[PDB]
């Protein structure tokens, strides 16, 4: 009888939850106001403390009798009054500039249908079996009206419920840090995987700002790093039978003491570094003496140029064939590229010996600087902290930023100068900014064109550099068709840069100029001014 009626009201229970939205609104509408009453008087209380001077009306001024006076009337019947207007002090007409952040680097860039249910599968047979004229029918019953998910849709929704109970609070694959008192015995591949994923070789750090690109960090050097075999290199270390010397290669007086599971977490990490050092493994972590560390280990063992963007072009087994990306990009197969020195697109380096930025030098002749390991002959790696080296193709590498002086330019708003005199072709800091893709450059270009701004430059055939929201000082320098300086694109170990150099001998106090090299619409609309006098 009432079985079905009690069932009949079961799926109508959702409408009761509709008015629960306003359950606690009035309660908090009282708490906040109560606190407001406390705060408002306190400020008023302080306002009671400080005496305040009244107002004073104007008067006729002997030196300003004829000051121009405005008149204010009343929209209503009130009288009309006329009082003079005393002009305020002079204000300096200052040119306009737009907010930013100091950037010294280059960085890559209501429906009518809803869902919900109740997980009462225990009692749905009370709903159906004990409520017919069973449990699985909840998916179907919830599915007639489009206000809830369909019978199948609820099944994935219930799969979320099991994925909502879950084990303890932790990401499914991450492991606690070893420094933590709950250090686990996570093996080398799993533990280093977090380091593997986060690390980035190009800028030799973790999670490079300026760089989904990933490579397996298997390294093509010799497979092992063996140190010592069957020898007492430690203060007291095993030798045993010497037939194990080949066995260690083939795998590729006993005594003992206790151990701990936590210390074993790094023990077979140590065997991943040397694989046979009986002593350094004991030196770092071990509950056994350097004698017995072998005993623990043995049972453990028994248990035509430029244009495109650089890329570490790959060919793991095959040589640098057509599948080698550098064949397509038309540039070098650098050390990061999977070509060896055998691969003919290997770059030799900065082969100079005396000066490695001179007219006849591969650094200066080509578009590439000298890496510290390239003109080692001329001290490219000589005291990077020190600024005195014969290799001048390291200024950006050593970050020898110039002293740029912000100033206001009659040509356009503000401008940039230099503190020290600079002769022809000396360094000026790089146009530090952000590297965006071509498509967003189209998006940002029209945005910048919409706001009539100029901080965008095409990096190469593959990318475009932006320095609008974050940039360096030189982005505030003006332009001249007859500039005193120039911008020249630089390469750094497969990274696109741009060097700024003075065209002529220049003393302190000269404004900086260059050419944006923009589209025709971009040029005239922005730099169609050159400050020339016409007599006739």
């Amino acid at each position: 009888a009432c079985r079905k009626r009690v069932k009949s009201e079961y799926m109508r229970l959702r409408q009761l939850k509709r008015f629960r939205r306003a359950d606690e609104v009035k309660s908090m509408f009282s708490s906040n106001r109560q606190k407001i009453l406390e705060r408002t008087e306190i400020l008023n209380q302080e306002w009671k403390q400080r005496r305040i001077q009244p107002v004073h009306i104007l008067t006729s001024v002997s030196s300003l009798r004829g000051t121009r006076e405005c008149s204010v009337t009343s929209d209503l019947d009130f009288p009309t009054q006329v009082i003079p207007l005393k002009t305020l002090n002079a204000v300096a007409s200052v040119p306009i500039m737009y907010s930013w952040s100091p950037l010294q680097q280059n960085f890559m860039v209501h429906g009518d249908r809803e869902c919900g249910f109740i997980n009462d599968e225990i009692f749905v047979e009370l709903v159906n079996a004990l409520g017919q004229y069973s449990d699985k029918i909840f998916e179907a019953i919830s599915s007639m009206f489009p206000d809830k998910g369909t019978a199948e849709e609820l099944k994935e929704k219930y799969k979320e419920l099991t994925e909502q109970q879950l084990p303890g609070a932790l990401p499914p694959e991450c492991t606690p840090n070893i420094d933590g008192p709950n250090a686990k015995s996570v093996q080398r591949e799993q533990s280093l995987h977090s380091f593997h994923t986060l690390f980035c070789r190009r800028c030799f750090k973790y999670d490079c700002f300026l760089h989904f690109h990933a490579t397996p960090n298997t390294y093509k050097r010799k497979n092992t790093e063996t140190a010592l075999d069957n020898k007492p290199c430690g203060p007291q270390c095993y030798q045993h039978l010497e037939g194990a010397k080949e066995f260690a290669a083939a795998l590729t007086p006993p005594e003992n003491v206790e151990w701990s599971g936590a210390e074993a977490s790094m023990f077979r990490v140590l065997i991943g570094t040397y694989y046979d050092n009986f002593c350094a493994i004991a030196r770092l972590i071990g509950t056994k003496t350097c004698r017995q560390v072998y005993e623990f280990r043995v049972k453990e063992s028994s248990i035509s140029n430029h244009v495109y963007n650089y890329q570490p072009c790959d060919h793991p087994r095959q040589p640098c064939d057509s599948s080698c990306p550098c064949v397509i990009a038309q540039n070098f197969c650098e050390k990061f590229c999977q070509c060896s020195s055998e691969c003919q697109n290997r770059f030799p380096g900065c082969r100079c010996k005396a000066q490695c930025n001179t007219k006849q030098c591969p650094c200066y002749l080509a578009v590439r600087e000298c890496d510290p390991d390239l003109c080692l002959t001329c001290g490219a790696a000589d005291h990077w902290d020190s600024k005195n080296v014969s290799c001048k193709n390291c200024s950006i590498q050593r970050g020898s930023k110039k002293h740029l002086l912000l100033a206001p330019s009659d040509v356009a708003g503000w401008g940039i100068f230099i503190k020290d005199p600079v002769q022809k072709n000396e360094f000026i800091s790089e146009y530090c900014g952000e590297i965006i893709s071509q498509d967003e450059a189209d998006r940002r270009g029209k945005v910048y064109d919409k706001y009539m701004c100029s901080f965008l430059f095409n990096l190469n055939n593959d990318f475009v550099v932006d320095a609008t929201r974050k940039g360096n000082k030189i982005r505030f320098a003006n332009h001249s068709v007859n500039p005193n300086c120039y911008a020249k694109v630089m390469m750094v170990n497969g990274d696109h840069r741009i060097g700024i150099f003075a065209k002529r001998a220049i003393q302190t106090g000269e404004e900086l100029f260059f050419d944006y090299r923009y589209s025709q619409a971009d040029a005239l609309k922005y730099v169609g001014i050159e400050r020339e006098m016409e007599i006739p």
């Binding site: 280093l192 977090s194 380091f195 030799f204």
Partner: protein, 100 residues
């Protein structure tokens, strides 16, 4: 001059960029944040520079790591760069011996 190796705001930018990882522990996170922050603070790019960076990371702020007691993550951090062919065996023991 305002010409320094790193503006102050960038330090917390990567701090936010590192800390956002819901899948990375705090012990490893804090060390690498400390490890990130010194690298641009000195601007060392060469392999020996990276070797010189580690000996400068210790004995200057590795005591803070000792103060933070975040060693075991750092030791795995030290072997990581070793296995990343940037650091030799002789360098990793210097940090090990400095604590001990």
């Amino acid at each position: 001059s305002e010409d320094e190796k790193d503006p102050e705001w960038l330090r917390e930018k990567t701090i936010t960029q590192i800390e956002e990882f819901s899948d990375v522990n705090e012990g490893e996170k804090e060390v690498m944040k400390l490890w990130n922050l010194h690298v641009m603070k000195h601007g060392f790019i060469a392999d020996n520079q990276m070797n010189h960076a580690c000996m400068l990371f210790v004995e200057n702020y590795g005591q803070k790591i000792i103060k933070k007691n975040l060693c075991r993550n750092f030791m795995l951090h030290l072997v990581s760069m070793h296995d990343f062919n940037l650091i030799s065996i002789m360098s990793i023991d210097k940090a090990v011996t400095k604590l001990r």
